[PDB]
Design a protein around this ligand. Structure first.
Ligand SMILES: Nc1ncnc2c1ncn2[C@@H]1O[C@H](COP(=O)(O)OP(=O)(O)O)[C@@H](O)[C@H]1O
Ligand SMILES: [Mg+2]
Lengths: 337, 52, 261, 171, 85
C-alpha cells in the first residue's frame, strides 16, 4: 500500500490525454477507473485531480467506495468490465484500471461467508480465482473481424509486507499478462516509481511498443536483472567488480535513469534518448548522482535545439538508420556536458 | 603554438556578432512576452469566473 | 529454511568464531615476533635519525604481503596504496611477495612486475627465508642501482585501524656520503657503505614483512569478527522468521481443524 | 528564425577555445533560454481572450454576469502600447561591437601573417653553423648593452651561461 | 496484542538473555511503564533518569561488540558503563 500503484495508474490516465484529445479514434484510449475499496475522500481527490488536468472528459469513475455494502464492491469491477467491453466491442480502445482488487476479493469473502458457500483455501472461497479469471480475461485485444478493439487492463493488488507468495498474489500474478512490482523499500529509498526491474515481467517484451523504445531496450530488463545479481555478487566478495564492471556501471546508471515524478506524463518521444544513452554505454562518465540532472539537461537539449530527430521519432513511431544516427550524434555531442 | 592559438578569431567574429545581437534583441523584446502573458492571465481569470 | 538455518549456525558462525580464535592465537605469537624485530627496527631508525642518511636523486617497488586471501580490507588497502604509488611513478621493477598482492599487481601493472614469490604466508615469519629473499632481490634485481626502494606493509595502531606505512631504504650511494656521516666512525677498507646498505635492506624488509603479517592477521581477526556479527544478526532475524513460520504452521492447523471439524 | 540562432549559439558554446572564463554571457544564455521557454509556454497555454459564448453561454441560464465579463474583455485587449524600443543602448552596444570587432579581426589577421612570415624565414633559410657574431650584433644591439652592464658591475658569471651549453672544464 | 493493548504498558522478557547469563532478562527497549514514573519512589525516580539513556546508548552501540577498541573512546566508555549496569 502507498507504493505508487494508484500513482502509476493516474499517470497513465493523464498520459492518455495526448492521444484521446485528437480525432483518430484508433489511437484514443477512453479510460475507465475502478475505485473499489477506496474511501470517498480519496476518490473525490482523484476525480478532482483528473478534471484539473482535463482528464475527466474521457475517464469513467464507475466504482464502489467503502461506504456501500460488500456486494457493491464485488460487482463494481465487473460492471466496469462491461463498460470496457462496450468500448471494445464498438471498435474503440479503452484502458481499465482495477484499482486494488483485494477489497473486491474480501467483499466476495463477505458474501460467501453468510451465503452458505464454504471457503476453499486460506479462509478464501475457491471461486476467487474463477472470478478474477472471468473479470480480467474479458480484457483483450479484439481482431479486425470483431472491430480491432482493445480493452487494456491495469489490475492493482495491495499485498502485505511485499508477500507476493500469498494466495491472492499467486492467483492474480497467474491471472495477468505480467506484473509491475512496487516494493515499499524502493519508495522509502527515494525512487518515487519504486519499481523493481528484476521481477516486473510482461508478455510484450520488445512487442506492442512504439518501436523506437523497443529497439533501444528490447532486452534491457534482463541486463538490469543481471546487473542487480552481479552487484549483489560484487558486495559478496572483493574481485573484478564494482566500478570496474562496465555491466554494473551501466545497470546502476540505467536504474537511476528509470525515475519519474507524479502528475508528470512524459511522451514517448522524450524517452528514447535517455534509454539509448543508458543502454549503449554512453553513461560511463556521468556519475550516479548527476544522472538526475543529466536527464533534464538532455531532454531540454532535444526540446530546444534538437527537435528535428525528436519530432521525427514522434511522427514515425520508430527510429530508423537515419534516426539512430541522429540520436547517436546528439548523445555523444551532449555526453561532454 | 602561438600560430594555432591565435588562429581562431577569423570565422568566429561573425558568429559572436550575430549571437550577441540575437541574444540582446530576444532579451529586450520580452515586452511582447509580458503582454501575451498578462492577456493569458486575464483570459484565464475570465474563464475561471465562467466555470465558477 | 531448516538447511539455511543449519548452514548459518554451524557452518558460518561457530567455525568462523573458532577461526577468529585461531587467528588471535596466531596474533599473539606474531605480536611477540613483531616486537622482537621492532626492537632492532627502533634501534636502526633512531640511529638513522641520529645520522641523517637521506638520499638525493631507476626505482624499486617491493610488494610485501602474507598469503591470506583478502581478509576484508587489508589487501584492498595495500592494492590501492601501490596503485597510487604506481600513478606517482610507473617505471619501477615491482617485486611481489604473496598471492593476493601478486594477482592484484598482475591485474594493475603486469608490465612493471618482474618477480613473484609464493609460499611465504604459511605461518609466522622466519628470518632465514626473509634474508634469502633479500639476497635474491639484491642479486637479480640489483637494488643498489635504484637510489630509492619502497616497501609496502600495513601497520595497525592498536587493534583495528591500519595504515600503509612505508619506510625509506638507504643505498650505498647515500651511505658513503650523507649530511651527517662524519659523526659515526667508519672503516674505508671494511666497505661499510655497502655492508650497511645490505644490512638495512635485510632488517627493514624482514621487520616490514613481520609487521605486514601481524597487520594481515589483525585484519583477518577484524574481518572474521565482522563476518561473525553478520552471522549473528542474520541468525537472529532468521530465527525470528523461523519462529514466525513454525507458529504459522500452528495457525494453519488451527484453521483447518476448526473448519474441517 | 529561432532554429538558426539556437544552432549558432550552441555551436559557439561547444566550440569555445579562447572564449572561456566567462561570468555574464552564460547569464544572458540562460536569460534567452528561459525567455524561449516562456514563449513556448504562452503558445501552448493560450487561453481564449474572447468568451466562447457559442458553446459556453448556453450552459449558464441565470448568468447576469456574461455581458459584464464580455464587455470587460472587449475593453481590455488593448492593454498598452508595446515597447519595441530596443534602439537606444542596444544599438550603441552593437555599433561598438562591430567597430572594435573589425579592429580585432584586422589585428589578428596581421598577427597571423607576421607569425607565418616568422616561421617561413626561420625554417627556410638562415643557417646557424656559418652564422657570424657581427650579424647578431647588427640585428640586435641589446646584447652590447648587456655586455656593458655586466662588465661595469664586474660579474662575469651571471647565472644561465653554460648550463645548456658545453663547459668542457678540462682542467 | 490484546493483552498489551488492555495493559497500561508491558515488561518484555526474552529467554536469550536468560541463556547468556542475564537471568533477570528485563529489556528496557521494549518495556515501558505509562504511569511508572508517577508511581515510583522519588529516590529511584530521580536517579533512574540517567540509567535509561546509558543503557539505551549501550544497547544501540552494542552491534559492534569486538570493535570498540579502535572505534571511538565515547563508544568504549558507553559499552563499559552499559555492561557494568
Ligand atoms: N513523485 C511521486 N510519485 C508517486 N507518488 C508520490 C510522489 N510524490 C508523492 N507521492 C505520494 O505517494 C502516494 C501514492 O499512494 P498510492 O499509490 O495512491 O496508495 P495506494 O497504493 O494505497 O493506492 C500519494 O499519496 C502521494 O502523496
Ligand atoms: Mg489508492
Amino acid at each position: 500500500r502507498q507504493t505508487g500503484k494508484t500513482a502509476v495508474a493516474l499517470d497513465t490516465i493523464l498520459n492518455q490525454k495526448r492521444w484521446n484529445n485528437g480525432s483518430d479514434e484508433s489511437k484514443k484510449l477512453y479510460c475507465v477507473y475502478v475505485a473499489v475499496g477506496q474511501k470517498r475522500s480519496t476518490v473525490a481527490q482523484l476525480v478532482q485531480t483528473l478534471e484539473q488536468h482535463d482528464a475527466m472528459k474521457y475517464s469513467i469513475i464507475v466504482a464502489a467506495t467503502a461506504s456501500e455494502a460488500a456486494p457493491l464492491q464485488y460487482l463494481a469491477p465487473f460492471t466496469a468490465a462491461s463498460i470496457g467491453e462496450w468500448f471494445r466491442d464498438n471498435g474503440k480502445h479503452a484502458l481499465i484500471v482495477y484499482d486494488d482488487l483485494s477489497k473486491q476479493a474480501v467483499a466476495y469473502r463477505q458474501l460467501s461467508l453468510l451465503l452458505r458457500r464454504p471457503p476453499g483455501r486460506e479462509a478464501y472461497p475457491g471461486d476467487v480465482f474463477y472470478l478474477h479469471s472471468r473479470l480480467l480475461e474479458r480484457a483483450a485485444k479484439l481482431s479486425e473481424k470483431e472491430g480491432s478493439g482493445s480493452l487494456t487492463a491495469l489490475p492493482v493488488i495491495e499485498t502485505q509486507g511485499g508477500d507476493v507468495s500469498a494466495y491472492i498474489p499467486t492467483n492474480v500474478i497467474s491471472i495477468t499478462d505480467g506484473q509491475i512490482f512496487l516494493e515499499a523499500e524502493l519508495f522509502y529509498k527515494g525512487i518515487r516509481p519504486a519499481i523493481n526491474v528484476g521481477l516486473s515481467v510482461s508478455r510484450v517484451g520488445s512487442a506492442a511498443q512504439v518501436k523506437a523504445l523497443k529497439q533501444v531496450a528490447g532486452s534491457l530488463k534482463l541486463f538490469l536483472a543481471q546487473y542487480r545479481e552481479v552487484a549483489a555478487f560484487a558486495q559478496f566478495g572483493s574481485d573484478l567488480d564494482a566500478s570496474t564492471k562496465q555491466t554494473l556501471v551501466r545497470g546502476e546508471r540505467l536504474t537511476q535513469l528509470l525515475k519519474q515524478n507524479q502528475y508528470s506524463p512524459l511522451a514517448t518521444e522524450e524517452q528514447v534518448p535517455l534509454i539509448y544513452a543508458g543502454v549503449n554505454g554512453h553513461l560511463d562518465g556521468i556519475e550516479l548522482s548527476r544522472i538526475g540532472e543529466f536527464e533534464s539537461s538532455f531532454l531540454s537539449y532535444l526540446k530546444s535545439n534538437h527537435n528535428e530527430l525528436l519530432t521525427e521519432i514522434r511522427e514515425k513511431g520508430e527510429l530508423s538508420k537515419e534516426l539512430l544516427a541522429s540520436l547517436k550524434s546528439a548523445t555523444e555531442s551532449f555526453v561532454a556536458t | 603554438d602561438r600560430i594555432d592559438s591565435v588562429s581562431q578569431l577569423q570565422n568566429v567574429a561573425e558568429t559572436t556578432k550575430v549571437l550577441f545581437d540575437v541574444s540582446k534583441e530576444t532579451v529586450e523584446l520580452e515586452s511582447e512576452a509580458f503582454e501575451l502573458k498578462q492577456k493569458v492571465e486575464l483570459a484565464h481569470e475570465a474563464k475561471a469566473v465562467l466555470d465558477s | 529454511e531448516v538447511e539455511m538455518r543449519l548452514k548459518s549456525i554451524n557452518a558460518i558462525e561457530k567455525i568462523t568464531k573458532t577461526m577468529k580464535i585461531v587467528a588471535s592465537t596466531r596474533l599473539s605469537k606474531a605480536e611477540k615476533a613483531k616486537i622482537s624485530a621492532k626492537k632492532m627496527d627502533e634501534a636502526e631508525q633512531l640511529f638513522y635519525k641520529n645520522a641523517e642518511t637521506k638520499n638525493l636523486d631507476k626505482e624499486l617497488i617491493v610488494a610485501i604481503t602474507s598469503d591470506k586471501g583478502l581478509c576484508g580490507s587489508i589487501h584492498s588497502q595495500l592494492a590501492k596504496a601501490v596503485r597510487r604509488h604506481l600513478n606517482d611513478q610507473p617505471n619501477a621493477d615491482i617485486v611481489t611477495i604473496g598471492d593476493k598482492i601478486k594477482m592484484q599487481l598482475l591485474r594493475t601493472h603486469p608490465n612493471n612486475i618482474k618477480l613473484s614469490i609464493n609460499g611465504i604466508g604459511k605461518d609466522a615469519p622466519t628470518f632465514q627465508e626473509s634474508a634469502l629473499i633479500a639476497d635474491k632481490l639484491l642479486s637479480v634485481m640489483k637494488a643498489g642501482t635504484y637510489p630509492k626502494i619502497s616497501i609496502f606493509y600495513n601497520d595497525p595502531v592498536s587493534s583495528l585501524s591500519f595504515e600503509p606505512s612505508e619506510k625509506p631504504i638507504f643505498n650505498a650511494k647515500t651511505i658513503e656520503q650523507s649530511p651527517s656521516f662524519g659523526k659515526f666512525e667508519i672503516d674505508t677498507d671494511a666497505n661499510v657503505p655497502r655492508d650497511l646498505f645490505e644490512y638495512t635492506l635485510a632488517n627493514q624488509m624482514l621487520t616490514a614483512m613481520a609487521q605486514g603479517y601481524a597487520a594481515e592477521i589483525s585484519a583477518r581477526r577484524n574481518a572474521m569478527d565482522n563476518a561473525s556479527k553478520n552471522a549473528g544478526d542474520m541468525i537472529n532475524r532468521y530465527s525470528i522468521l523461523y519462529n514466525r513460520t513454525r507458529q504459522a504452521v500452528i495457525t494453519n492447523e488451527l484453521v483447518d481443524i476448526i473448519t474441517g471439524a | 528564425a529561432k532554429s538558426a540562432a539556437n544552432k549558432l549559439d550552441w555551436a559557439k558554446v561547444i566550440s569555445s577555445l579562447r572564449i572561456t572564463g566567462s561570468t555574464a554571457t552564460q547569464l544572458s544564455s540562460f536569460k534567452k533560454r528561459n525567455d524561449e521557454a516562456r514563449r513556448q509556454l504562452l503558445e501552448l497555454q493560450s487561453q481564449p481572450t474572447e468568451v466562447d459564448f457559442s458553446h459556453y453561454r448556453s450552459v449558464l441560464k441565470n448568468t447576469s454576469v456574461i455581458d459584464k465579463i464580455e464587455s470587460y474583455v472587449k475593453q481590455y485587449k488593448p492593454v498598452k502600447i508595446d515597447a519595441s524600443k530596443q534602439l537606444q543602448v542596444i544599438e550603441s552596444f552593437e555599433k561598438h561591437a562591430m567597430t572594435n570587432a573589425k579592429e580585432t579581426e584586422s589585428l589578428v589577421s596581421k598577427e597571423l601573417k607576421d607569425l607565418q612570415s616568422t616561421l617561413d624565414n626561420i625554417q627556410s633559410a638562415r643557417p646557424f653553423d656559418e652564422l657570424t657574431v657581427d650579424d647578431l650584433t647588427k640585428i640586435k644591439p641589446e646584447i652590447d648593452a648587456k655586455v656593458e652592464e655586466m662588465v661595469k658591475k664586474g660579474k662575469w658569471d651571471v647565472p644561465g651561461y653554460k648550463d645548456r651549453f658545453g663547459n668542457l672544464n678540462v682542467m
